[PDB]
């Protein structure tokens, strides 16, 4: 969370199994796999989903969600807004097991 | 620092140093065999509906009086341990009720949260009962009211008397806790089951109510948000059922 | 599709070694066994650089220190022609490695090709492809794919290049022409990194390569667009 | 004398001295963690599911082809272990197969009892793909045809192949037993967990099919019952599924 020092507000992280389909409400949130993310406590929430995998050779594959359990609460008028900045990173527990090229780079002619 | 508490599939932080209020000093447990008692009342134990519950926070505003949850009917709905109440006649649980409070340092105000056991509540119609309406909403709060409710069938909800007829002030007689928003935003209250019998049928009575009065009204400066959320965070203790094989 | 299956954690090919040193094909060129004016020979000046997937994966690392297997797959076609009654005997082919700093063959009967400090291999057709070894020949301690500076500070177009990231030049060419026909050879060289090691990893480049000896890009977006940030319905 | 059995809420009654198939001589197991293997794909077993489920029993008639059910879609809707399926992604579990025969020393004929892995069956149609309702009618039986099926989509039930392609009296090679009149009345046959995968999807996928085929024809002396019940208890064995907690 990336608000003032000042701001103080929950929200709703909801961790979605496989198969299970996202949340539509912040009652099927908080009945599920879920953290209350209290911005005013820390600043900071750490999630490990352990069920990724791939999903093809080349949905049902899990949702992450946060809800507005409360509303961001500041001491004087701020006119922007604040915002959350999101990290993702790999844990140890990951296998690779069959190199192929990736689908983001493309060489139709040659250079020379 | 901060301490997060994972039940089940849930997890929720909270402030390390925050007191916790367990009810008269006695902490939830299982009920005990009375010298190896016969198998005539079978008891059957839950732990998966060990998790928290977040109820939808209620909007606390500058001219806004209490709210009260019944917590056997306000757990009626959220999944399991609701399903546990349908499907089971007798029940037994104790509860930890979590309430937070979101609020800057520019924003004033006192609550008084207060778990009221057998909190049995009198009708605007001295002639009537009240409703299951009026009485409990379930998960959503039912509000108190800055003056006389009116209603064939309503509660009384008069802050004042916080709908029992009693002194509003001397609710701290009940296992409760202040929240100070210049000392304090949070609230924990671990409430044992409380009841004349061992177990008893759980749609059709209320062990107890939550109260969340405020007694010093919020206020905040020229530009702060002018509401403050608080959210009440539920954990069922202990829940116990009527075995439902058979005896032999 | 790919259904769960349960995790071994094979970090096996994830390694650096198993994730670069694979044998892909980096160059292709045609070359007669006639010529107009002796330019009938093929050329390469050794860069990893110019195939935008090998140079994808080597650029997302800074230094790199590694050896150049290099095979030719040479194949030799023959031309439509009035020539009649040819009977080509068997085709020998020519490939000098030309170390970094060494003689240029302007021709294919210059006198760079009968050198002495020049790798050559001679490669008779129907046999094994023909293979050389090319060590880590740098003059520094490691490849740079990177060069924040300039051959020259004084050089506006000299920014990158370096100087240490020279491989060298391949030089292919017929030793005999066979046949008094139209004969063209393909040469299809493979690169194959060996021994790789590699240094403060980088971002994977993002925007697609123009040029092979420039990081130049047009801005591109950090990915695809989506309708809406929430999952709502 | 007589074996009663009891699971969780249900309790049958088997006579003792009564041989068990037990699968291909492995006994249902838990899934075992390889070496302390990572919280990547967390498992979760379920002991209330470990119970008795009887389907409606089938009538064995004089002219009584054969009947099936592909367990993993037969018990879809028995309550728990169906509510698990249908919350589960991932499941796993091997079955208890009770087959009982209730007839008189007046009766004559004898059943092959037979659990058939990966039982993939053909088409009456031979270009198509027979339909989920043909394939498995859940607790209700599947029966075998005297002669050739008809339908666009239906599974060629013709008891020679049973519906496979195989001579049916080559059935034994699967864990099967005979229930002869005139000896046996009961077959158990203990089935674990057969995949190629460790779980995989249950609404997805049958493990197994069990085929009850009558080789010798029912027969009975004149005044005796034309009919005899055939009833079929089944008990799901270790069942495990994808656990649903988030991993930290």
Same mark, same amino acid.
């Given at each position: 969370?990336?608000?003032?020092?000042?701001?103080?507000?929950?929200?709703?992280?909801?961790?979605?199994?496989?198969? *299970?389909?996202?949340?539509?409400?912040?009652?099927?949130?908080?009945?599920?796999?879920?953290?209350?993310?209290?911005?005013?406590?820390?600043?900071?929430?750490?999630?490990?989903?352990?069920?990724?995998?791939?999903?093809?050779?080349?949905?049902?594959?899990?949702?992450?969600?946060?809800?507005?359990?409360?509303?961001?609460?500041?001491?004087?008028?701020?006119?922007?807004?604040?915002?959350?900045?999101?990290?993702?990173?790999?844990?140890?527990?990951?296998?690779?097991?069959?190199?192929?090229?990736?689908?983001?780079?493309?060489?139709?002619?040659?250079?020379? | 620092?901060?301490?997060?508490?994972?039940?089940?599939?849930?997890?929720?932080?909270?402030? /390390?140093?925050?007191?916790?209020?367990?009810?008269?000093?006695?902490?939830?447990?299982?009920?005990?065999?009375?010298?190896?008692?016969?198998?005539?009342?079978?008891?059957?134990?839950?732990? *998966?509906?060990?998790?928290?519950?977040?109820?939808?926070?209620?909007?606390?505003?500058?001219?806004?009086?209490?709210?009260?949850?019944?917590?056997?009917?306000?757990?009626?709905?959220?999944?399991?341990?609701?399903?546990?109440?349908?499907?089971?006649?007798?029940?037994?649980?104790?509860?930890?009720?979590?309430?937070?409070?979101?609020?800057?340092?520019?924003?004033?105000?006192?609550?008084?949260?207060?778990?009221?056991?057998?909190?049995?509540?009198?009708?605007?119609?001295?002639?009537?009962?009240?409703?299951?309406?009026?009485?409990?909403?379930? /998960?959503?709060?039912?509000?108190?009211?800055?003056?006389?409710?009116?209603?064939?069938?309503?509660?009384?909800?008069?802050?004042?008397? *916080?709908?029992?007829?009693?002194?509003?002030?001397?609710?701290?007689?009940?296992?409760?806790?202040?929240?100070?928003?210049?000392?304090?935003?949070?609230?924990?209250?671990?409430?044992?089951?409380?009841?004349?019998?061992?177990?008893?049928?759980?749609?059709?009575?209320?062990?107890?109510?939550?109260?969340?009065?405020?007694?010093?009204?919020?206020?905040?400066?020229?530009?702060?948000?002018?509401?403050?959320?608080?959210?009440?965070?539920? *954990?069922?203790?202990?829940? /116990?059922?009527?075995?439902?094989?058979?005896?032999? | 599709?790919?259904?769960?299956?349960?995790?071994?954690?094979?970090?096996?090919?994830?390694?650096?070694?198993?994730?670069?040193?694979?044998?892909?094909?980096?160059?292709?060129?045609?070359?007669?066994?006639?010529?107009?004016?002796?330019?009938?020979?093929?050329?390469?000046?050794?860069?990893?650089?110019?195939?935008?997937?090998?140079?994808?994966?080597?650029?997302?690392?800074?230094?790199?220190?590694?050896?150049?297997?290099?095979?030719?797959?040479?194949?030799?076609?023959?031309?439509?022609?009035?020539?009649?009654?040819?009977?080509?005997?068997?085709?020998?082919?020519?490939?000098?490695?030309?170390?970094?700093?060494?003689?240029?063959?302007?021709?294919?009967?210059?006198?760079s090709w009968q050198t002495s400090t020049n790798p050559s291999v001679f490669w008779t057709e129907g046999s094994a492809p023909p293979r050389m070894s090319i060590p880590f020949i740098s003059i520094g301690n490691a490849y740079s794919?990177?060069?924040?500076?300039?051959?020259?500070?004084?050089?506006?177009?000299?920014?990158?290049?370096?100087?240490?990231?020279?491989?060298?030049?391949?030089?292919?060419?017929?030793?005999?022409?066979?046949?008094?026909?139209?004969?063209?050879?393909?040469?299809?060289?493979?690169?194959?990194?060996?021994?790789?090691?590699?240094?403060?990893?980088?971002?994977?480049?993002?925007?697609?390569?123009?040029?092979?000896?420039?990081?130049?890009?047009?801005?591109?977006?950090?990915?695809?667009?989506?309708?809406?940030?929430?999952?709502?319905?």
């Amino acid at each position: 969370f990336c608000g003032s020092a000042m701001a103080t507000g929950k929200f709703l992280l909801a961790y979605s199994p496989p198969g *299970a389909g996202a949340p539509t409400t912040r009652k099927e949130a908080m009945l599920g796999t879920h953290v209350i993310w209290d911005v005013g406590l820390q600043s900071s929430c750490v999630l490990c989903i352990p069920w990724i995998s791939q999903t093809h050779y080349r949905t049902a594959g899990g949702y992450i969600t946060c809800w507005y359990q409360t509303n961001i609460v500041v001491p004087a008028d701020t006119q922007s807004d604040c915002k959350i900045l999101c990290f993702v990173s790999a844990c140890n527990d990951f296998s690779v097991r069959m190199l192929k090229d990736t689908p983001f780079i493309k060489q139709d002619n040659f250079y020379q | 620092r901060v301490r997060s508490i994972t039940l089940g599939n849930s997890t929720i932080t909270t402030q /390390e140093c925050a007191n916790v209020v367990v009810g008269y000093g006695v902490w939830p447990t299982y009920l005990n065999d009375d010298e190896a008692t016969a198998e005539d009342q079978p008891t059957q134990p839950d732990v *998966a509906t060990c998790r928290f519950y977040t109820l939808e926070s209620v909007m606390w505003q500058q001219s806004s009086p209490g709210w009260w949850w019944k917590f056997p009917d306000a757990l009626s709905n959220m999944g399991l341990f609701g399903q546990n109440m349908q499907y089971h006649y007798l029940g037994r649980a104790g509860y930890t009720v979590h309430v937070q409070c979101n609020a800057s340092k520019f924003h004033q105000g006192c609550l008084l949260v207060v778990c009221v056991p057998e909190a049995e509540m009198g009708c605007a119609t001295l002639a009537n009962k009240p409703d299951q309406k009026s009485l409990s909403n379930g /998960e959503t709060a039912n509000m108190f009211e800055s003056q006389n409710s009116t209603g064939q069938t309503a509660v009384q909800a008069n802050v004042i008397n *916080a709908g029992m007829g009693v002194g509003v002030g001397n609710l701290t007689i009940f296992p409760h806790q202040w929240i100070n928003l210049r000392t304090n935003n949070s609230a924990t209250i671990v409430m044992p089951y409380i009841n004349s019998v061992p177990m008893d049928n759980m749609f059709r009575h209320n062990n107890f109510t939550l109260m969340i009065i405020p007694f010093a009204p919020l206020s905040y400066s020229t530009g702060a948000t002018t509401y403050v959320p608080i959210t009440v965070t539920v *954990a069922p203790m202990c829940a /116990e059922y009527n075995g439902l094989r058979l005896a032999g | 599709q790919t259904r769960h299956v349960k995790n071994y954690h094979s970090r096996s090919e994830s390694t650096v070694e198993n994730f670069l040193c694979r044998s892909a094909c980096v160059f292709y060129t045609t070359y007669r066994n006639h010529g107009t004016d002796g330019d009938n020979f093929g050329y390469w000046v050794i860069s990893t650089r110019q195939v935008a997937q090998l140079r994808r994966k080597l650029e997302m690392f800074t230094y790199a220190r590694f050896d150049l297997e290099l095979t030719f797959v040479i194949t030799s076609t023959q031309e439509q022609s009035t020539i009649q009654g040819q009977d080509s005997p068997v085709l020998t082919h020519q490939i000098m490695y030309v170390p970094p700093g060494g003689p240029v063959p302007t021709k294919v009967n210059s006198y760079s090709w009968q050198t002495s400090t020049n790798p050559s291999v001679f490669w008779t057709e129907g046999s094994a492809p023909p293979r050389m070894s090319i060590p880590f020949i740098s003059i520094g301690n490691a490849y740079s794919m990177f060069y924040d500076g300039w051959a020259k500070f004084d050089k506006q177009g000299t920014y990158g290049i370096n100087t240490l990231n020279n491989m060298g030049t391949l030089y292919m060419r017929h030793v005999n022409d066979g046949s008094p026909g139209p004969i063209v050879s393909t040469v299809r060289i493979y690169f194959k990194p060996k021994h790789v090691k590699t240094w403060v990893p980088r971002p994977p480049r993002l925007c697609q390569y123009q040029k092979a000896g420039n990081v130049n890009f047009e801005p591109t977006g950090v990915t695809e667009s989506r309708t809406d940030i929430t999952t709502m319905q």
